[PDB]
Scaffold this active site. Structure first.
Site, PDB file in Angstrom:
ATOM      1  N   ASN B 375      42.252  29.596  41.882  1.00 46.59           N
ATOM      2  CA  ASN B 375      43.082  30.812  41.869  1.00 46.59           C
ATOM      3  C   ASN B 375      43.579  31.023  43.590  1.00 46.59           C
ATOM      4  O   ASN B 375      42.852  31.370  44.378  1.00 46.59           O
ATOM      5  CB  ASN B 375      42.253  31.919  41.592  1.00 46.59           C
ATOM      6  CG  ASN B 375      43.015  33.508  41.571  1.00 46.59           C
ATOM      7  OD1 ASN B 375      43.722  33.725  40.598  1.00 46.59           O
ATOM      8  ND2 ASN B 375      43.046  34.111  42.706  1.00 46.59           N
ATOM      9  N   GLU B 376      44.838  30.638  43.618  1.00 44.37           N
ATOM     10  CA  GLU B 376      45.424  30.869  44.801  1.00 44.37           C
ATOM     11  C   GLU B 376      44.756  30.045  46.138  1.00 44.37           C
ATOM     12  O   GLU B 376      44.639  30.362  47.328  1.00 44.37           O
ATOM     13  CB  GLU B 376      45.457  32.258  45.389  1.00 44.37           C
ATOM     14  CG  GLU B 376      46.105  33.356  44.481  1.00 44.37           C
ATOM     15  CD  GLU B 376      46.042  34.761  44.953  1.00 44.37           C
ATOM     16  OE1 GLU B 376      45.213  35.183  45.613  1.00 44.37           O
ATOM     17  OE2 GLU B 376      46.922  35.445  44.596  1.00 44.37           O
ATOM     18  N   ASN B 429      50.647  34.414  40.680  1.00 41.00           N
ATOM     19  CA  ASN B 429      50.006  35.631  40.954  1.00 41.00           C
ATOM     20  C   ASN B 429      51.285  36.600  41.896  1.00 41.00           C
ATOM     21  O   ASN B 429      51.344  35.945  43.103  1.00 41.00           O
ATOM     22  CB  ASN B 429      48.747  35.618  41.816  1.00 41.00           C
ATOM     23  CG  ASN B 429      47.765  35.249  40.904  1.00 41.00           C
ATOM     24  OD1 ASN B 429      47.660  35.202  39.845  1.00 41.00           O
ATOM     25  ND2 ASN B 429      46.562  34.691  41.509  1.00 41.00           N
ATOM     26  N   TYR B 435      53.288  44.388  47.472  1.00 37.63           N
ATOM     27  CA  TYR B 435      53.335  43.704  48.748  1.00 37.63           C
ATOM     28  C   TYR B 435      54.757  43.244  49.120  1.00 37.63           C
ATOM     29  O   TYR B 435      54.685  42.045  49.841  1.00 37.63           O
ATOM     30  CB  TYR B 435      52.251  42.272  48.583  1.00 37.63           C
ATOM     31  CG  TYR B 435      50.933  42.703  48.420  1.00 37.63           C
ATOM     32  CD1 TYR B 435      50.240  43.683  49.261  1.00 37.63           C
ATOM     33  CD2 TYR B 435      50.154  41.949  47.792  1.00 37.63           C
ATOM     34  CE1 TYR B 435      49.018  44.072  48.918  1.00 37.63           C
ATOM     35  CE2 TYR B 435      48.791  42.213  47.545  1.00 37.63           C
ATOM     36  CZ  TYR B 435      48.252  43.059  48.296  1.00 37.63           C
ATOM     37  OH  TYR B 435      46.808  43.331  48.027  1.00 37.63           O
ATOM     38  N   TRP B 508      46.583  43.130  36.752  1.00 38.15           N
ATOM     39  CA  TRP B 508      45.762  43.096  37.670  1.00 38.15           C
ATOM     40  C   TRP B 508      45.736  44.773  38.493  1.00 38.15           C
ATOM     41  O   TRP B 508      46.714  44.850  39.254  1.00 38.15           O
ATOM     42  CB  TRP B 508      45.791  42.143  38.756  1.00 38.15           C
ATOM     43  CG  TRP B 508      44.558  41.997  39.676  1.00 38.15           C
ATOM     44  CD1 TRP B 508      44.437  42.589  40.885  1.00 38.15           C
ATOM     45  CD2 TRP B 508      43.494  40.900  39.372  1.00 38.15           C
ATOM     46  NE1 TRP B 508      43.049  42.156  41.337  1.00 38.15           N
ATOM     47  CE2 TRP B 508      42.820  41.151  40.551  1.00 38.15           C
ATOM     48  CE3 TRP B 508      43.131  40.335  38.323  1.00 38.15           C
ATOM     49  CZ2 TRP B 508      41.601  40.507  40.644  1.00 38.15           C
ATOM     50  CZ3 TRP B 508      42.078  39.473  38.595  1.00 38.15           C
ATOM     51  CH2 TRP B 508      41.134  39.638  39.588  1.00 38.15           C
ATOM     52  N   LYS B 529      43.969  48.785  42.304  1.00 36.01           N
ATOM     53  CA  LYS B 529      44.984  48.446  41.518  1.00 36.01           C
ATOM     54  C   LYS B 529      44.638  48.516  39.725  1.00 36.01           C
ATOM     55  O   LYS B 529      45.799  48.111  39.157  1.00 36.01           O
ATOM     56  CB  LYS B 529      45.273  46.887  41.723  1.00 36.01           C
ATOM     57  CG  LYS B 529      46.134  46.573  43.068  1.00 36.01           C
ATOM     58  CD  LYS B 529      46.325  45.142  43.363  1.00 36.01           C
ATOM     59  CE  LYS B 529      47.015  44.793  44.401  1.00 36.01           C
ATOM     60  NZ  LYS B 529      46.258  45.263  45.757  1.00 36.01           N
TER      61      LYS B 529
HETATM   62  O1  LIG Z   1      45.495  41.171  46.288  1.00 36.63           O
HETATM   63  C1  LIG Z   1      44.998  41.672  45.291  1.00 36.63           C
HETATM   64  O2  LIG Z   1      44.797  42.954  45.090  1.00 36.63           O
HETATM   65  C2  LIG Z   1      44.287  40.837  44.094  1.00 36.63           C
HETATM   66  O3  LIG Z   1      45.320  39.644  43.975  1.00 36.63           O
HETATM   67  C3  LIG Z   1      44.677  38.176  44.093  1.00 36.63           C
HETATM   68  O4  LIG Z   1      45.155  37.713  45.096  1.00 36.63           O
HETATM   69  C4  LIG Z   1      43.078  38.417  44.361  1.00 36.63           C
HETATM   70  O5  LIG Z   1      42.519  37.223  43.665  1.00 36.63           O
HETATM   71  C5  LIG Z   1      42.376  39.488  43.892  1.00 36.63           C
HETATM   72  O6  LIG Z   1      40.978  39.180  44.244  1.00 36.63           O
HETATM   73  C6  LIG Z   1      42.834  40.646  44.479  1.00 36.63           C
HETATM   74  O7  LIG Z   1      42.141  41.773  44.173  1.00 36.63           O
END
Ligand SMILES: O=C(O)[C@H]1O[C@@H](O)[C@H](O)[C@@H](O)[C@@H]1O
Ligand SMILES: O=C(O)[C@H]1O[C@@H](N2CCN(C3=Nc4ccccc4Sc4ccccc43)CC2)[C@H](O)[C@@H](O)[C@@H]1O
Ligand SMILES: Cc1cc2nc3c(=O)[nH]c(=O)nc-3n(C[C@H](O)[C@H](O)[C@H](O)COP(=O)(O)O)c2cc1C
Ligand SMILES: Cc1cc2nc3c(=O)[nH]c(=O)nc-3n(C[C@H](O)[C@H](O)[C@H](O)COP(=O)(O)O)c2cc1C
Lengths: 659, 639
Positions: B375-376, B429, B435, B508, B529
């Site tokens: 993940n990322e 993502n 952001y 998310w 979130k």
């Molecule tokens: O940035 C964020 O709010 C969310 O997005 C992702 O990059 C991360 O995996 C997650 O843990 C974060 O809670």
């Protein structure tokens, strides 16, 4: 301009320290109050729950604090004894963990991040009550901890955790002359005092205005709605503000206007009319959280009581939560308050009894639901009333009367105690704790006993402060004493109600207990560390059949309860079925067919039905109904069995309940 | 005769010890599991939650034990690294606190008073994932601890915490040939009686070997078809010795086929089945991650009400109970490992172990369909990162042929990065709308990628907006208000739910979660979130924007009930509903009717005095209150 700040979160706790830390700990356990370190080991049995000195540490950042002239640290529950250190300097000490106490710490907040350390202890000594009792002494800060920010001229906060406001009405015909007495600390003859009495609807019904020296002021309420228990639990509001030309402080309190007496022949008298006091008592704990109760818990406890229909509650064996006293004033419940002066008389306990009893009255004086202060509970179990025990009770009794001219003193006497004991003559009324039917004897012995006392002392009001029977998830078709079956507990209470509720001279009856409670020395039943003498389980999740035997006698909720729904497997070919109902007539249907109708003025319908296969019993009473299930089996299901002339084993488990 | 015994009560805990106690501690703090020591300090902010080694102590009474031949101590969740001592002797170690592991301690119960010490650690190192992520690393034994009593000859208990039973159904048109593989230990002249039952427990197949494989056929297949019909067969196998049995493992399973089409999106059992859902963390406010079954039930109930078809169980292996709940409710699940954010070269060994554990333990859950790898992870790519991901991909493909692999890409990652080409499918993502940028950017972005890589099924693994108890009439990125979080999600559905090539979307997040390093919004230590608050007590308005698109439960929701004081003379009233028409009544009088294909009903109303608004969609209604004021109530603004 008064402000109370919660101080419950971020508390470092440990039981391993042996000294006050000079710097805030980093590897301590994080707890948020209410909290107790006996929530687990104080309910599992063994009398093993850790008793010692444990430490709470938190930092009061001067910044995150409103600007005022004096800062007080309020503690509402520190069982049993506590010392309050600020920046490593001892600042206060208190004994008895059931009363509110405060401390001024303004001069001790020198640094920006001041370290507050509170050492709590629930150990053994001859100084602080309770020391010998049948309930776990949960240790820790199990109640709120606050910071009070007030002006340099504020209503006294340094008097036994009192509210700084005293309200004593006097009912003259259809009106009331309410005397409101406030107390000051560092006052000025200039500032005025504005008394205000507000209606239950926030309607100003009267007002006065005196000077800083006139802490008394008699307001008047015309056409007073009297506090009449459950019939009409009316409540007024008293507000007094210390006014230059603006309010610098202000305490307030609700009160109720009522008159009561305890006639030795007519029982309790509430506002002129007869008001039979028939209810229960409750401990201030719940399964899993020790006594770290939350407002919801107090609300759920009193809600089950109101459903059951009790008119009075015995808040033993100590002072209870303020919020619960407030709930009783709201629901119009007549309340019995007492102190942990229980079991053995410790000569060195004097200093504590006066303090705790002083704290119980100053802090709860305004609750209209309270009518009796208890001085002791079975205080003669150790020996007999020597001069010390007698002089100790005389001091408390004289003291209580001196401060409160509106309530009566009482005591709870141990069963074995002879009725001619000298100390039964000190209080205004008395009550006995009798377990005929669960300890040696028969349930039928209760009625005559109370009668014999009433004969020898007809002008000393007699009551039942305690009576009960243990009951778990055990069952049997042949109920006996010592089988701990839910069935027997139903019988025991059935007959108890018939004897006590029909005797008007018994001023109050108090079932022991409303809920099962924690007593880490109890090794009885299958569940250890518990007393199972309640109508409701410790987790408050199951209402025992006995719960409904009382609802039938005290509740207006039309209902029909089929008892023994947990006793499915039955071996007999014609089995007994009991139904409780506050309705005149009940008809029981076995498998759809009618087994007959039954009338029972005592509300205790005892049917008999055929035990054939899996049957679905249904009980109807008007439009209200209930359903249960039975099933014929060849042999008795052992899952139902738990296997003074007690048996050896039973008596050992009971002897262990001491230590 | 296999026996599982609960062992979570009375546990002595401390954060101050530096060695394994020789005797049972007397002054330690009592706790009952599930438990974690980061339940307060790990959700308050400041990134200050204690991370180190802490000790659990509890005695095992030999007498009080159903005795057969062997006793295994089973740990279902020890975050992160743990060591197990029995009478002061070391017996096992584990890394990665999200998977099940066990250890035979039979030979070590020499005394009657057996002292068990489990040292759990959640510190900082270069070997064990996760280390860099936006969620708290709750420490301690936050899952069950059991004592398994089995015969000397039992089903394998020592292979990466697996069940010792593998069910791989093959669909031969309208029939099923469900392979059943069992694994033994110290076995023998012994037989295996395989049995396959249905939902009602009626035997649908049986056989007997001596030979750990067995293909059983169940004709008239009742397929596990997601929410439409999450049918579940249960498989049982028993090790026989003559006429009795000495051990028996079981497992529910589901027969189904699926395909992730780069054009038609997700396909289930032949026909398209759009996967549009959310993701969930395994923590709740006040208790860290020491979750009880009720907390898992309440979490899945809230998502079912929302009507989602898929959940991304990120960023790690979850509780076996929650997986079981997904199998019953027919949800399609994306599982993954804590391989997140930064590539630790020395962490490869842990990714293989944790990845091996995730598949072996959750192979039978019909709800899972994709195994996540990272993940990322590119927060550019390198051969080590590329070789690590290639290693997992091959391993996953060789162990389970029935599922697909995937990864979650950071939005900045250049689409032409070599790492995006390793797994079967991918997801991005994207936080266009929180952001930076505009929410309108997500539509074109997903379009652009699918143009360059049309053969690679693209999905949205994450997207969200933060929202708290803040309200305004001028919603703007950065106010943290509930209104903008609804605007954002409204436009995101219109963009995402209308593009069939997006094989799956994961809001998310479903719930707010603990992220002790966060310090924003006015409530520190949390990421806000989620659609539901951290305590799961309040469903945010955005929760109902999705309910309108995914739930068949008739409903009508009035947005902005908590924004009462408004300054404008004309106010906007938003209503979500899966019903065709909604009429709005302002103090009894009708302000008009509205139809909205996108289920987003935007009305306009005069704000005169204390107005009471009522939304009607036939027999269902919703109520709200507003009142006109002179100045903005600054208790709404995150000033
Ligand atoms: O940035 C964020 O709010 C969310 O997005 C992702 O990059 C991360 O995996 C997650 O843990 C974060 O809670
Ligand atoms: O017994 C209860 O369940 C409740 O009723 C009251 N007890 C207090 C103590 N005593 C007990 N009785 C007996 C009875 C028969 C033989 C011997 C004894 S010795 C004893 C030893 C340990 C515990 C209790 C007893 C009288 C009744 C208390 O007032 C209340 O605190 C308690 O919870
Ligand atoms: C119900 C009640 C509440 C009282 N509250 C206070 C108070 O808050 N502050 C105070 O200075 N005196 C208060 N008093 C007055 C004391 O009872 C008494 O006048 C004196 O302060 C006590 O003296 P002693 O306890 O040292 O013997 C209160 C009295 C009663 C009856
Ligand atoms: C889902 C799944 C579960 C498995 N469970 C076991 C098991 O419990 N015991 C066992 O011996 N092999 C089990 N295997 C087989 C191993 O994965 C593989 O055949 C081989 O034993 C791997 O050995 P290794 O640990 O040296 O890599 C399982 C395989 C899969 C795909």
């Amino acid at each position: 301009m008064r402000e109370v700040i919660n101080f419950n979160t971020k508390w470092a706790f440990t039981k391993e320290a042996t000294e006050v830390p000079k710097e805030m700990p980093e590897k301590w356990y994080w707890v948020t109050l209410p909290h107790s370190w006996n929530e687990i080991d104080g309910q599992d049995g063994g009398n093993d729950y850790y008793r010692g000195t444990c430490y709470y540490a938190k930092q009061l950042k001067k910044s995150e604090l409103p600007e005022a002239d004096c800062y007080y640290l309020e503690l509402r529950g520190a069982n049993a004894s506590a010392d309050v250190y600020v920046n490593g300097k001892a600042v206060a000490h208190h004994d008895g963990g059931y009363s509110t106490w405060r401390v001024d710490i303004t001069k001790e907040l020198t640094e920006e991040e001041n370290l507050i350390v509170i050492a709590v202890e629930n150990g053994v000594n001859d100084r602080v009550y309770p020391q010998n009792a049948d309930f776990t002494f949960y240790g820790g800060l199990y109640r709120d901890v606050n910071i009070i920010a007030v002006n340099k001229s504020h209503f006294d906060l340094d008097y036994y955790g009192g509210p700084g406001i005293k309200v004593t009405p006097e009912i003259k015909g259809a009106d009331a002359s309410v005397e409101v007495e406030v107390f000051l600390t560092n006052a000025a003859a200039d500032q005025k005092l504005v008394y205000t009495v507000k209606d239950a609807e926030g309607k100003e019904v009267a007002k006065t205005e005196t000077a800083a020296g006139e802490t008394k002021a008699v307001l008047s309420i015309p056409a007073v709605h009297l506090w009449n228990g459950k019939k009409d639990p009316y409540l007024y509001t008293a507000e007094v503000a210390l006014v230059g030309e603006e309010a610098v402080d202000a305490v307030s309190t609700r009160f109720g206007c009522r008159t009561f007496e305890i006639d030795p022949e007519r029982g309790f008298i509430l506002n002129g009319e007869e008001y039979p006091l028939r209810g229960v008592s409750r401990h201030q704990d719940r399964w899993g959280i020790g006594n770290a109760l939350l407002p919801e818990h107090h609300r759920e406890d009193i809600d089950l009581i109101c459903e059951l229909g009790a008119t009075t509650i015995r808040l033993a064996h100590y002072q209870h939560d303020q919020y619960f006293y407030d709930l009783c004033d709201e629901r119009g419940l007549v309340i019995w308050a007492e102190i942990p002066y229980i079991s053995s008389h410790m000569p060195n306990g004097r200093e504590n009894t006066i303090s705790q009893m002083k704290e119980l009255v100053v802090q709860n004086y305004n609750h209209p639901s309270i009518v009796v202060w208890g001085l002791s509970n079975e205080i003669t179990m150790a020996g007999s009333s020597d001069e010390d025990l007698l002089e100790n009770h005389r001091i408390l009794n004289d003291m209580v009367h001196e401060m409160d001219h509106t309530r009566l003193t009482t005591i709870a006497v141990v069963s074995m105690c002879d009725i001619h004991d000298p100390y039964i003559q000190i209080p205004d009324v008395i009550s006995y704790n009798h377990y005929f039917g669960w300890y040696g004897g028969d349930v039928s012995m209760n009625g005559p006993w109370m009668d014999n006392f009433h004969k020898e002392f007809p002008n000393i009001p007699l009551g039942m402060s305690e009576y009960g029977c243990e009951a778990l998830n055990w069952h049997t078709s042949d109920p006996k004493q010592g089988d701990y079956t839910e069935e027997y507990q139903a019988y025991y209470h059935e007959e108890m109600i018939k004897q006590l509720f029909t005797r008007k001279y018994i001023w109050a009856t108090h079932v022991w207990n409303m809920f099962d409670f924690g007593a880490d020395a109890r090794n009885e039943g299958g569940e250890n560390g518990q007393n199972h003498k309640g109508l409701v389980t410790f987790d408050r999740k199951y209402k025992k059949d006995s719960f409904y035997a009382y609802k039938a006698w005290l509740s207006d909720e039309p209902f029909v309860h089929l008892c023994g729904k947990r006793y499915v497997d039955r071996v007999e070919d014609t089995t007994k079925v009991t139904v409780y109902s506050n309705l005149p007539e009940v008809e029981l249907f076995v498998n759809g067919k009618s087994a007959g109708k039954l009338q029972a003025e005592d509300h205790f319908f005892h049917f008999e039905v055929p035990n054939v296969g899996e049957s679905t019993l249904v009980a109807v009473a008007g439009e209200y109904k209930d359903e249960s299930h039975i099933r014929k089996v060849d042999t008795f299901n052992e899952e139902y069995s738990l296997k003074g002339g007690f048996t050896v084993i039973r008596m050992i488990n009971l002897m262990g309940a001491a230590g």
